[PDB]
Design an enzyme around this catalytic site. Structure first.
Site, PDB file in Angstrom:
ATOM      1  N   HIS A   1       0.807  -1.219   0.000  1.00 24.32           N
ATOM      2  CA  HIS A   1       0.000   0.000   0.000  1.00 24.32           C
ATOM      3  C   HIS A   1       0.847   1.279   0.000  1.00 24.32           C
ATOM      4  O   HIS A   1       0.285   2.374  -0.044  1.00 24.32           O
ATOM      5  CB  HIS A   1      -1.003   0.005   1.170  1.00 24.32           C
ATOM      6  CG  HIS A   1      -0.389   0.140   2.537  1.00 24.32           C
ATOM      7  ND1 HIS A   1      -0.558  -0.806   3.526  1.00 24.32           N
ATOM      8  CD2 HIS A   1       0.376   1.114   3.083  1.00 24.32           C
ATOM      9  CE1 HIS A   1       0.062  -0.417   4.627  1.00 24.32           C
ATOM     10  NE2 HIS A   1       0.654   0.737   4.379  1.00 24.32           N
TER      11      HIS A   1
ATOM     12  N   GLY B   1       2.996   5.952  10.540  1.00 29.59           N
ATOM     13  CA  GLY B   1       4.322   5.819   9.970  1.00 29.59           C
ATOM     14  C   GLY B   1       5.049   4.545  10.333  1.00 29.59           C
ATOM     15  O   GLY B   1       6.193   4.351   9.889  1.00 29.59           O
TER      16      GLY B   1
ATOM     17  N   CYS C   1       4.113   1.492   9.529  1.00 27.09           N
ATOM     18  CA  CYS C   1       3.914   0.447   8.534  1.00 27.09           C
ATOM     19  C   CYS C   1       5.263  -0.023   8.005  1.00 27.09           C
ATOM     20  O   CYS C   1       6.176   0.777   7.798  1.00 27.09           O
ATOM     21  CB  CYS C   1       3.045   0.962   7.381  1.00 27.09           C
ATOM     22  SG  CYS C   1       1.408   1.490   7.911  1.00 27.09           S
TER      23      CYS C   1
END
Lengths: 306, 305
Positions: free
Chosen positions: B41, B143, B145
């Site tokens: 993503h 942030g 991820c």
């Protein structure tokens, strides 16, 4: 979201751990620049551990009597000195992995990460608080002597602790990196016991703020209090007196949540007397006191290191 | 002695995190050899987050749409492909600090360490478990991820989790390093919700044994139970049912303490009925389920590592 007990990333320190051997005893050392730091009771035998003469036992030792291994490589000792309860071994090679570091001595209530090691090899990392009786409630098996505790600031490693022994209640005692014990302990095979511990009140408050930040708020009430009223309650529940200083470090959290410190204090005093009503805060059924205000800030805003 | 929630030393994984940017999206990536892994993503924009067509999105990207920075240094992307929900970016430089490693997929109840990172920089390390609803109860800010979970048994790093998203209840979902999500979740911003979370019974039993190993005895009783009768009771407390495989797994700890597995089950049943009476076990006032039998053995007997 979420809130865990969290240690500093240990990479800068794992590059510093070595194995030290003196006769039959082997333990961990900290290799910085060209010096290896380790507990001075490594020179001891079982015979002269009830009454060590550490100056006497030291000089009789040769630089080649100390065997220092860094992994598959051996380190030649070219000198030794004793500073308080820490042995220093000069070796002929600087550690190419020495990070930026400094030796600091911490205050009761402050937290640090421990890198538990055995045979010079980093085994695990965990977060401890320096208790008010100067012990830490760690996890240390035989051979973890010389493991170190540290904090990280920006990219500077602050070494605060080096592990020496276990007390008969299972709590642990050690020194700063200049060899001074935390608390009223000695490195002799004598009878020692920790003093009475107290709850680190400011840490409980910080943890309650972390719970509110995370949407856990059933304990908030409409009341407030003062330092005087709170502290009279605190002593009877064995809590550390809350000073004017403590309130101001809680400032940022008091802002970011809209709960004033003496407001939060009234919630905590109710929890002391009434209890937790069979509920949990942040997935705990007890008041957690090993998160400092900086720990909560560092975790709820995402500070990173190097 | 003592018993603490312990993580693995994180240095081996620290040497692998980098920052991955695509367009205006920045997250963490995992740099092993000449591949950087990150959640796919990272290639979504704000118009493509309910029903993103990742194959469509990716073919429209050039190598120069991806900015990868290892600290001060810029890594030149030379190819890109997609494996399930993980992006793989080929770079012109193998990572010199790549450890010995493998990718594993874990089962519920398993624990692992998490190296939480922001902009490719480590913020801290903590221990987690994969719950039976296939979420973890991590600690992640925006942030994070691309942060990873891992175990380090001996000198091999076992990567088992990459963080992708937070669910409306505060819990987190992610994939293995092959890009397959744990559980029924998808990397879409559509409505998703965690199934019911059960207490990991085999882990609680392991922790109770760790307590006895460490000298705690106040919760023992003289009762034993059958496996069926225990599951009937524990179900009512939203505990995971105990299988015969779990009973076998507890065999070593059972032998080391002298307490039969089914007799410890009787102790757990009573603790559920009365609670703690204000007492603690191993420093905790509730029943801990984030220690495996394997974790208990490693911490209580020789670990070295």
């Amino acid at each position: 979201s979420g809130f865990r007990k969290m240690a500093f990333p240990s990479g800068k320190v794992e590059g510093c751990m070595v194995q030290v051997t003196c006769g039959t005893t082997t333990l961990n050392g900290l290799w910085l620049d060209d010096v290896v730091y380790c507990p001075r009771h490594v020179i001891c035998t079982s015979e002269d551990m009830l009454n060590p003469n550490y100056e006497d036992l030291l000089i009789r030792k040769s630089n080649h009597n100390f065997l220092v291994q860094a992994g598959n490589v051996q380190l030649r000792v070219i000198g030794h000195s004793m500073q308080n309860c820490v042995l220093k071994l000069k070796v002929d090679t600087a550690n190419p992995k020495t990070p930026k570091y400094k030796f600091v001595r911490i205050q009761p209530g402050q937290t640090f990460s421990v890198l538990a090691c055995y045979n010079g090899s980093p085994s695990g990392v965990y977060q401890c608080a320096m208790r008010h009786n100067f012990t830490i409630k760690g996890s240390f098996l035989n051979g973890s002597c010389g493991s170190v505790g540290f904090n990280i600031d920006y990219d500077c490693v602050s070494f605060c602790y080096m592990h020496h022994m276990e007390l008969p209640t299972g709590v642990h005692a050690g020194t700063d990196l200049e060899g001074n014990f935390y608390g009223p302990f000695v490195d002799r095979q004598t009878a020692q016991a920790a003093g009475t511990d107290t709850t680190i009140t400011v840490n409980v408050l910080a943890w309650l703020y972390a719970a509110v930040i995370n949407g856990d708020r059933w304990f908030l009430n409409r009341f407030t209090t003062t330092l005087n009223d709170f502290n009279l309650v605190a002593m009877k529940y064995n809590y550390e007196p809350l000073t004017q200083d403590h309130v101001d470090i809680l400032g940022p959290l008091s802002a970011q949540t809209g709960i004033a410190v003496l407001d939060m204090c009234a919630s905590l005093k109710e929890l002391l007397q009434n209890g937790m009503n069979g509920r949990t805060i942040l997935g705990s059924a007890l008041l957690e006191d090993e998160f400092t205000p900086f720990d909560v800030v560092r975790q709820c805003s995402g500070v990173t290191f190097q």
